[PDB]
Design a protein around this motif. Structure first.
Motif, PDB file in Angstrom:
ATOM      1  N   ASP A 139     -23.756  34.732  35.336  1.00  0.00           N
ATOM      2  CA  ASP A 139     -23.199  35.090  34.034  1.00  0.00           C
ATOM      3  C   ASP A 139     -23.751  34.231  32.909  1.00  0.00           C
ATOM      4  OD1 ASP A 139     -21.692  36.537  32.238  1.00  0.00           O
ATOM      5  OD2 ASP A 139     -19.742  35.962  33.074  1.00  0.00           O
ATOM      6  N   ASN A 140     -24.615  33.264  33.231  1.00  0.00           N
ATOM      7  CA  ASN A 140     -25.162  32.334  32.254  1.00  0.00           C
ATOM      8  C   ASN A 140     -24.023  31.614  31.552  1.00  0.00           C
ATOM      9  OD1 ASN A 140     -27.407  34.931  31.908  1.00  0.00           O
ATOM     10  ND2 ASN A 140     -28.094  32.889  32.543  1.00  0.00           N
ATOM     11  N   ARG A 141     -23.954  31.741  30.226  1.00  0.00           N
ATOM     12  CA  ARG A 141     -22.851  31.173  29.459  1.00  0.00           C
ATOM     13  C   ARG A 141     -22.755  29.663  29.687  1.00  0.00           C
ATOM     14  NH1 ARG A 141     -19.790  28.629  27.534  1.00  0.00           N
ATOM     15  NH2 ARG A 141     -17.984  29.133  26.216  1.00  0.00           N
ATOM     16  N   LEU A 142     -23.885  29.035  30.017  1.00  0.00           N
ATOM     17  CA  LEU A 142     -23.870  27.633  30.412  1.00  0.00           C
ATOM     18  C   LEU A 142     -25.124  26.893  29.959  1.00  0.00           C
ATOM     19  CD1 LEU A 142     -24.468  27.262  34.315  1.00  0.00           C
ATOM     20  CD2 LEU A 142     -25.676  28.854  32.820  1.00  0.00           C
ATOM     21  N   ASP A 143     -26.272  27.570  29.958  1.00  0.00           N
ATOM     22  CA  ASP A 143     -27.553  26.896  29.746  1.00  0.00           C
ATOM     23  C   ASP A 143     -27.762  26.535  28.269  1.00  0.00           C
ATOM     24  OD1 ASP A 143     -28.131  30.007  29.694  1.00  0.00           O
ATOM     25  OD2 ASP A 143     -29.872  29.107  28.702  1.00  0.00           O
TER      26      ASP A 143
END
Length: 500
Positions: free
Chosen positions: A158-162
């Motif tokens: 979901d990404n939302r982190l990098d």
């Protein structure tokens, strides 16, 4: 589909255990057929018939030669039969090293894969999945070898982190007996080591600060678990053998077979008078060690030193007593005493001593030695009453040795078969002693097992109990194996169904 794959790994671990177990137990059974009149049983029969031919014609020197010939064939057969088990045990020991080497290659390749999957760089989707496919493949292969625990937390795309950074140790951990073989991207191998020249491999997990965690008694499952259970896990450098193990148990029964065969035959043949009697070299027999502690087959009781003249008449009897504290020095103190309050025949005739008895310990060799030399015109024998003193130490015995690998005819008999006697009094005429050795084949005698039990059987019955135990083990395992295959196939079908 991930859960059935978890079941597939466990099914593989159980099946590969019983598969390797079946292969080894089947080979051992081929070497030890549970059949009458084959192998050692056939040599034992030809040996007892040779005693019967000799007892029939004890003055014919040809029957003495035939008896010694059939006895050497028997002992050598006992030597080779033990060498067969020794060779299989060493073969399993070598397989342990190979399996540990394979476990390490798998773990290293998994940790290297994880350096890409959890690396800083972004990987193409297809390359990431084929690396993950290979890691699952290596994990599955590992389960054929050992019980390993793979704890995994899977990444959410979901990404939302990098841009962040990955904690690979929290994503994947591969452990054996609790110790991390793969901690995220870090590889920690299993370590092999040995201490004596049997190269009895031990399996270790070493920490970065070189601390040692031995796993030989704990590792289980798959081929490695079966290798460890067959070979043995607790090696003993003092005794040069394993304290456990299925194969080790077969070797110990084979030694107990030879030990009893040596003891019971020598007990009888020692009662045949001789000009002098000499023990084998008794390794580590200091004069102060209690006899029942030096050799577990020595029992409390008594034996009589018996003196004959050269025409074969009993002149003397000196009873020597063994209790649980009697040492070899104690045996000498009793032999070298005088008193002897007896009432033979005639006119108070029995006088002084007709033997030179001796014990000596060689500090340079570590061996003890016991001798009784009857003075010229006399012969000496030993009639035991439960102790196995002369039989275990081969004092005036027919066989030498302590186990299946050193069992042999006494050298002075091999080198001159004409020295063989059949009578109690030592004259080359009678056969009352040889008849006792013939009858010994039907007699229930004691077998002091390593496990602490005492079997009371005949020689043949004890050996057939060993070949029956080997067959029973291979059959019991065949049942567990059979259900392991059906479970494996069932789980394998469920794994194929729940995937592509």
């Amino acid at each position: 589909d991930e859960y059935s794959y978890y079941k597939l790994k466990g099914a593989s671990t159980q099946l590969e255990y019983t598969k390797y177990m079946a292969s080894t137990l089947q080979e051992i059974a081929q070497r030890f057929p549970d059949l009458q009149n084959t192998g050692i049983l056939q040599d034992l029969e030809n040996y007892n018939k040779a005693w019967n031919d000799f007892a029939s014609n004890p003055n014919e020197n040809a029957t003495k030669i035939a008896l010694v010939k059939a006895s050497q064939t028997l002992t050598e057969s006992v030597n080779n039969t033990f060498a067969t088990l020794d060779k299989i045990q060493k073969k399993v020991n070598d397989d342990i090293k190979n399996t540990v080497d394979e476990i390490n290659r798998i773990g290293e390749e998994i940790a290297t894969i994880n350096k890409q999957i959890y690396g800083q760089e972004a990987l193409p989707t297809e390359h990431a999945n084929e690396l993950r496919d290979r890691r699952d493949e290596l994990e599955l292969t590992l389960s054929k070898l050992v019980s390993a625990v793979a704890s995994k937390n899977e990444i959410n795309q979901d990404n939302r982190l990098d841009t962040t950074i990955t904690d690979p140790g929290h994503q994947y951990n591969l452990s054996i007996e609790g110790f991390s073989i793969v901690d995220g991207i870090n590889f920690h191998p299993l370590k092999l080591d040995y201490d004596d020249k049997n190269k009895s491999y031990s399996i270790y997990y070493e920490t970065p600060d070189e601390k040692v965690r031995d796993l030989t008694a704990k590792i289980s499952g798959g081929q490695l678990g079966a290798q460890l259970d067959l070979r043995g896990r607790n090696y003993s450098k003092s005794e040069g053998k394993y304290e456990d193990g299925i194969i080790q148990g077969y070797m110990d029964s084979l030694d107990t077979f030879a030990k009893t065969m040596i003891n019971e035959t020598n007990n009888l043949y020692a009662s045949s008078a001789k000009s002098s009697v000499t023990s084998d070299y008794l390794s580590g027999l200091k004069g102060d060690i209690p006899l029942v502690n030096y050799d577990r087959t020595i029992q409390p009781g008594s034996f009589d030193i018996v003196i004959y003249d050269d025409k074969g008449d009993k002149k003397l009897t000196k009873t020597i007593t063994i209790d649980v504290n009697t040492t070899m020095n104690d045996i000498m103190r009793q032999i070298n005493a005088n008193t002897d309050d007896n009432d033979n025949k005639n006119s108070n005739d029995d006088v002084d001593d007709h033997i030179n008895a001796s014990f000596s310990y060689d500090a340079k060799t570590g061996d003890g030695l016991f001798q009784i030399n009857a003075k010229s015109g006399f012969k000496v024998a030993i009639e035991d009453k439960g102790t196995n003193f002369a039989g275990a130490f081969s004092i005036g015995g027919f066989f030498s040795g302590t186990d299946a690998s050193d069992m042999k005819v006494k050298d002075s008999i091999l080198n001159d078969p004409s020295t063989v006697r059949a009578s109690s009094n030592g004259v080359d005429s009678g056969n009352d002693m040889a008849n006792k050795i013939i009858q010994l084949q039907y007699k229930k005698v004691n077998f002091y097992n390593e496990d602490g039990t005492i079997d009371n059987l005949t020689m043949e019955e004890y050996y057939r109990k060993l070949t029956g135990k080997i067959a029973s083990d291979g059959e019991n395992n065949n049942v567990v194996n059979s259900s392991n295959e059906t479970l494996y196939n069932s789980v394998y079908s469920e794994y194929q169904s729940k995937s592509g």
